[PDB]
Amino acid sequence: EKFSALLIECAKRKLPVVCFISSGGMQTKEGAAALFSMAVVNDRITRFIRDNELPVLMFGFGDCTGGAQASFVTHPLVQTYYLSGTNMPFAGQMVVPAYLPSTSTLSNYLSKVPGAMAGLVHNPFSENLDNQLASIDPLMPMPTAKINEVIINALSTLVVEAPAEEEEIVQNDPRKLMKPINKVLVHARGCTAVKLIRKAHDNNINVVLVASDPDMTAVPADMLKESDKLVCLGGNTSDESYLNAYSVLKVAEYEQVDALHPGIGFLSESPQFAALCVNNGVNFVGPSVHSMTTMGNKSNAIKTSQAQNVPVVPGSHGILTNAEQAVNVASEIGYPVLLKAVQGGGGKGIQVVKRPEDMIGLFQKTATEAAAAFGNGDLYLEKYVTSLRHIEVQLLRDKFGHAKVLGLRDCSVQRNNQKVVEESGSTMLPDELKKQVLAYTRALGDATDYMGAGTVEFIYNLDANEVYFMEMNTRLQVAHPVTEATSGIDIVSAQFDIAAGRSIEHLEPKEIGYAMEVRVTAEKAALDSHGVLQLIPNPGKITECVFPDHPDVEIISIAAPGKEVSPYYDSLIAQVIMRGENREDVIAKLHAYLDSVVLKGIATNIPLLKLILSDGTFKEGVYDTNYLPRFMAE
Amino acid sequence: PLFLQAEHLAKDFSLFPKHSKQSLSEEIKGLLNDDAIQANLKDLASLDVDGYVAKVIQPTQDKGRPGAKRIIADLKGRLITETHLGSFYSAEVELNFGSRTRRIGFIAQERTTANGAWMPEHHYAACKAIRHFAELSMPIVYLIDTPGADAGEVANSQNQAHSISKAIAESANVDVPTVGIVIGAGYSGGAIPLAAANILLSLRDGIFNTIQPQGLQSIARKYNLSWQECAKSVGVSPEELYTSGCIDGIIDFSPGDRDERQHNLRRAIISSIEAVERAAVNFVRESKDLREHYDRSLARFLNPSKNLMALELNAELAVATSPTNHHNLFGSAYRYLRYLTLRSRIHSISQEQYGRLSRVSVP
Amino acid sequence: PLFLQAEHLAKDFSLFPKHSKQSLSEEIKGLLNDDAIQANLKDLASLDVDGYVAKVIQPTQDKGRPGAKRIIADLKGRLITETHLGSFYSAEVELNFGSRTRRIGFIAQERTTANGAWMPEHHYAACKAIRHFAELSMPIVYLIDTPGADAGEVANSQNQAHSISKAIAESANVDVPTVGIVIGAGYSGGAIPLAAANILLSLRDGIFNTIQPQGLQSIARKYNLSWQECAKSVGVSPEELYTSGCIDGIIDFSPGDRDERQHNLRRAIISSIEAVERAAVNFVRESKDLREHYDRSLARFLNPSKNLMALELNAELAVATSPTNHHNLFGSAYRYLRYLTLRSRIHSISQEQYGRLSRVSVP
Ligand SMILES: Nc1ncnc2c1ncn2[C@@H]1O[C@H](COP(=O)(O)OP(=O)(O)O)[C@@H](O)[C@H]1O
Ligand SMILES: [Mg+2]
Description:
This is part of a larger assembly, with three copies of chain A.
Chain A: H1 2-13, E1 20-23, H2 36-52, E2 57-64, E3 79-83, H3 102-105, E4 119-121, H4 129-136, H5 147-156, H6 174-177, E5 183-186, H7 190-202, E6 206-211, H8 219-222, E7 229-232, H9 245-254, E8 259-261, H10 271-279, H11 289-296, H12 298-307, H13 323-333, E9 337-341, E10 351-353, H14 356-374, E11 379-383, E12 388-397, E13 404-415, E14 418-423, H15 431-447, E15 452-461, E16 466-473, H16 480-487, H17 491-498, E17 514-521, E18 523-527, E19 533-537, E20 540-541, E21 545-546, E22 553-557, E23 564-565, E24 572-580, H18 583-596, E25 598-599, H19 606-612, H20 616-620, H21 627-632
Bound molecules: adenosine-5'-diphosphate (ADP) and magnesium ion.
The site of adenosine-5'-diphosphate has 15 residues of chain A, from strand 12 and strand 15.
């Protein structure tokens, strides 16, 4: 890939190519896939001389063996050279069954053998080499040309075309593509698509919407105007529709869109999908690909946090190798502990391990969970904190470097890691630790050169009274309209300004009252095998659905009379975000509003939501992340 | 500028392998389905190293296994020419495509001479044969079967590397549909001029790998394994090669079968050549730059400029050796497609992308 | 457009034959020169009709004359395959051109059966061979030797009229160099699909006429002549056919020759085919409208409409039934140049160009 990239820079700028090649052969520890490098690089050198004419030199040095020797180095259009004393056989000592004479392997004896090289050159490092080789055999063929003589003769016989003014090594940079947006592709479905389609109207941008067959007649498609576009992706499930990145890019190219909003879920947080758009010159609304890989790779997110004096959640800090490694790091932290997948997220593959006796079997087990779920068995260890708050802090940042941190949220009422009752503040978090997580968000935002909207996640240990960085969301977070209310700053509009190339210096983050979000989901109550109450999805047609108009609540929704909730997608049917002066008032208004809200046809999670808002411990604000499954058993 | 475009497209198509249009594995009629491949992955996972060696490695080593000529004869077409030259076997057979008969070129590694181990003159014969089929517009089926090309003293004295570098150069730049089919073992630089095809297939019990599994013994000594452990760790079964994206499917045929499965080899060839030709026509429908590349290559045949004309004389390459034997516009499409598939078979990442290992609890 | 210009330039070529750019026979080695032919024109003028008939017509009445297969075999090329039924021969011989060896298709009227008289199934077999050589990028050499194609009751019941016109259509529009060579007698509808060439030659003792000399007997009865007198008056000699522009060259070769005149045959085929190829390369540099014709021809292959495709299916003609077996740009030069060649040796004049005969003292 580096050889193809270089021959491309040489074809663009009209450079002669010089190569110094030494190899033990093709890397066998890369699999059978490594062999194709012989034909890839050889084809790019065949095409480079046959389309661009510029001479390729191949100075074989050291040991020059295996597939590097057997392809591009000795290719019939290149000027093949060897340094004195170069070992040049088809394969090296690792593969060769028995001794090969220096007459058939050393470049000296091959110098006069026809078609072996255009010349044997002097080795300019080994001072006495040609006299050391003449003392071994005086009838050995000696080198004649220098590397400087071959290069000056190669350069001077060419036509000296007038050189253009120098450019840098041109790479994927969204900041160049960031131009004013009047038509945007929205890569989303559901409540996230309704949110982004609403923001597109509010910023005066036309939507190009893409959708699956159930979602062609969804509420985000109905919200579109005659000037907005809807395009069929086909199929029912995510695999047949939204996860086809080439179909979505081909729509971005066809409609000639000014930018692409990568949404939330699907391919939103993938640096591969960000790179795919920016390769083809399509502006990606969010951070740089560099910022996404630095804070998306879990080991490197911890190492960047360590460099910025931000405490991390204590663990292995890199990735674990084996079960013996997992036992030793777990013992140093103190049991119980966590095993997590690197390519995880959404609570998937997070195993708690209680003992060293358990860890030997539970490492092998959770490595199989990660390998089954993602195709990578890589575990990394973290300290299991039992009493915590999931605190998360919203960052905005432009290309100029203004790290406008909007405020925090507490998302501790959660069921199977999925957030349920989310808040604008934390009732157990000291103002000093709040100030520490605000400072750490700025340090990370500036030191990764982050752009767009992002959310850094913190564990706020209730037992220790400490805040620890866990990971980062390198995209838009579903909890965002809670912080839109309380910061006084619109997160998607600021992101659309940033992705238009504008500055966010002018913004003033506030702390306007309090806010809370309940995620309204289409789920029915049902008992488990021991008799503890669970919620599980209820698909079907909605017959009646009324959300009364109220000034201090925001409703993002896909539920309406005559619409169906699809079994191929999530039960999230609305986000109901209450605002108010104080926390008791926000809880009481949200409790009263949930009773004024009506849903029929489907079942909904609302019988549970009403009871959490009428709990005394929740009204006092005294809980942790494991509150909800305990409370559902009460 | 097609040279810049093919690295762009192949980088795009390697960012998400599954939903890419480089997936032609649905087209070929006579392959095993993805369910049988998943079931064979479960068996190879649950088996040990000896059970893996018995399933995968031992049938490709079998001396009773039908040779390249016997497999080509049991396509049941009409042979027009043959060239047996040691472990090289080129041929030319008319196959029925249903609408009419068609000349299909062959270049095969014959296991019944030197075990399929190629010498310098066999690579020079493969160079010549690849131009010869291009000059006559004949699609080529490559048949891969080798312990690797010879690393011996006679080979390197005859400049072995320099014959293979030309053979890969002709194969990469040939103006006809190329299909690879592994009929035994595809080891090292002897396997890659033939496996450099548009669509690389394998028979049900074939193998494709970086070197022969006994050559991993040096790396096994260095890290204290056996060479059999290193061979399973590398993952050399047709199922694992299809999972990694090295090959485009597993043909439901093994050289000794005599049931319904012997008919799958000609059917897989017919539907592969038809699939590459439909795909190449679709590329000429949508690429206006493929015209510009062809016109720039045509202008060199009209006016051969002295510096590249002298290079073509000394290099002896597959060029327009006549206006009649000059390639078509679709010829340049087979080069283009062949690069996109070869370049999406290779894969690399970055230092920022790679997940760092734990320094903690390491003596 | 090409079609409008193709008639115009060939119409301009018919105004002045002598200093035209169509003369390629000056560059071909193995022909009789102008000086040798002038001496024989004096001899043919000074001979009576009986001496003319013995020089020109009687050597093709030789029943022991070396056949069309045997003339191809004395090239001493490499035989790849031969197709033979009745008086139809076709072959595929890899001949050394000096620079390298090259496959050249041969299609031949063989005189050892029926004197060379082709039935409808031979014209359909010639069509099959003409399709194959177009698809497989092979130059054709036609050999003409026949009393004419069979015009009997079974021929017209089998629809000889459509079989002949299909063969003339496919030969006129074939996308490879065609070189006709009159090795004995060529007459009417049986000889004209094979005389539809980029260069048409003869041997030293051949004949080429509208119909056989003896078939002029019906016309001889009108004017009270012998059939022999009619053939001498219209001039069926290779020398008078060269002078009237019907043939490009008379090869200094008769089928029985055993000296260096047997070498002239091979040299004449090689330097005919290289001259036709050089002429196609020059015309591609000269013509922008040939480029536009290649685009329009290839664009209807990219988007085959039901009306266009349905007529092509009914006709079964030589067409691009594959992208790999689609013609190149020089194929479109061989169809264009073949038209110019055949069109410049027809002439016609207007009523004002014709001068009136005297009616004075003719009651
Ligand atoms: N030991 C732990 N301490 C804190 N949280 C934990 C622990 N183990 C699992 N979790 C859950 O995972 C959260 C950390 O983020 P996570 O849920 O992995 O994010 P996502 O799945 O959305 O990427 C914690 O807030 C908690 O809900
Ligand atoms: Mg989380």
